[PDB]
Structures are given as structure tokens and as C-alpha cells.
Amino acid sequence: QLKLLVTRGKEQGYLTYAEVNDHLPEDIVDSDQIEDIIQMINDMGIQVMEEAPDADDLMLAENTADEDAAEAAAQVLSSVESEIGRTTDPVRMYMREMGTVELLTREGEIDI
DNA sequence: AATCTATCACCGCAAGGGATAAATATCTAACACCGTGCGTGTTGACTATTTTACCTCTGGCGGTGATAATGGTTGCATGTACTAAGGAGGTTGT
């Protein structure tokens, strides 16, 4: 399932730690795995959590990657595929696999 | 294993029925003739048997279209009766 978390995080340019339960991957339960896999969620999406800023927004601009070329932008196939429903159809798995591409049409595939 | 008297009857032996085969008379069929016409023969002119050549069919198959069209389908495996196995995880114990 996964796409909800990673897409809304990239739209926001930022993702707070606890929003892993606000936009949950409807798949898995790995709560103690988080404390290292958060690494490649942050070198291309960095954020953390505290009571309140006042003038402090800029942090992303000195601390982040720049092309989303092939990495967690596409190897995330495994982490969206990983829960195909044990007895239920190829007419389901393709819906998880297209968890990659949404609708790059009308100019994005022209840029390809 | 021979003897017979005394059964129920086959012989004892008169009658008469059908049969078949002779002679006759009828039938048909086998043939020998005749006449028809067809498949007896060569020859000849036809036209389209086959071949090859040429000019120009049919169907071999390779090739791929653009005003634009950019989140899909798919219905019923089964409702029962069993129960053996693996899977879970907290814990009260080993």
C-alpha cells in the first residue's frame, strides 16, 4: 500500500516522525526498524519534532539531495509490494506496483 | 450267470392308405437364324492434351496508421464436517 505516506511527505517537502501513523502504510508493523530506515527517508526528505517554531523554516535548503534519480524513488517497489494478499490475484499486485507512477502524462513523458 | 412264468403288452400277420413313377401332355427355354447398330478400322482436320514461352492473375506476407484518445477490471472458490497442523504472543512456569 505505502504510497500515501511517501507522496504526501514529498508534496509537503517535510514529514514529522509521528505522521507514520497519520498516513500509515496499510501493510506492516515494524516500529523498532524505524530508527535506521529513517536515514534514507531523511537524506531526501529531512524533518524532526518539537513544541513550536517562530522563524526557523529554512533547514531543508542546506541538508537534502537534488534529483530523486533511481534510489528510494524506485527501490521503494519492495516496500510497497511486500504484502500481496497471500491467495489473492495478479489483478491486485499491479495496483501496488503502480504505487510508483501516478499520471506523468501530457508533458512528463514528453520530458522522458 | 443261468432258469422261467406271467406281466404289460409287440407282435401276430389282416387290412388299407399314400405314394411315386410310369405315360402322357403340356410348358418353357435354348438355340440358330436374322437384322440392327454400335464402338470394327484408318484416315484426316480439327482444337485446344501437353509442353514451353511470354505477358502480366492470385495471393504470398510484410509492414505498421496519429486532431486526440494516458486509475483498470473482475464477480462469485465457499458457507458443511470433520480435525491436523502451523501460526501467533503473553506469560507462568521449565
UniProtKB/Swiss-Prot annotation:
Under the subunit heading, UniProt states: Interacts transiently with the RNA polymerase catalytic core formed by RpoA, RpoB, RpoC and RpoZ (2 alpha, 1 beta, 1 beta' and 1 omega subunit) to form the RNA polymerase holoenzyme that can initiate transcription. Identified in a complex containing RpoD, the RNA polymerase subunits RpoA, RpoB and RpoZ, CRP and DNA. Interacts with Rsd; this prevents interaction with the RNA polymerase catalytic core and with promoter DNA, and as a consequence, promotes transcription from promoters that require alternative sigma factors. (Microbial infection) Interacts with Escherichia phage lambda antitermination protein Q.
Provide the domain comment: Contains 4 domains, connected by flexible linkers. In the active conformation, the domains are in an extended conformation, each making extensive interactions with the RNA polymerase catalytic core.
Q: What does this protein do?
A: Sigma factors are initiation factors that promote the attachment of RNA polymerase to specific initiation sites and are then released. This sigma factor is the primary sigma factor during exponential growth. Preferentially transcribes genes associated with fast growth, such as ribosomal operons, other protein-synthesis related genes, rRNA- and tRNA-encoding genes and prfB.
Family assignment from sequence similarity:
Belongs to the sigma-70 factor family. RpoD/SigA subfamily.
Q: What is this protein called?
A: RNA polymerase sigma factor RpoD
Can you say where in the cell this protein is located? Cytoplasm
- Full-protein positions shown: 8 to 119 of 613
Using the UniProt annotation, give all residue ranges assigned to the region (Sigma-70 factor domain-1): 1-73
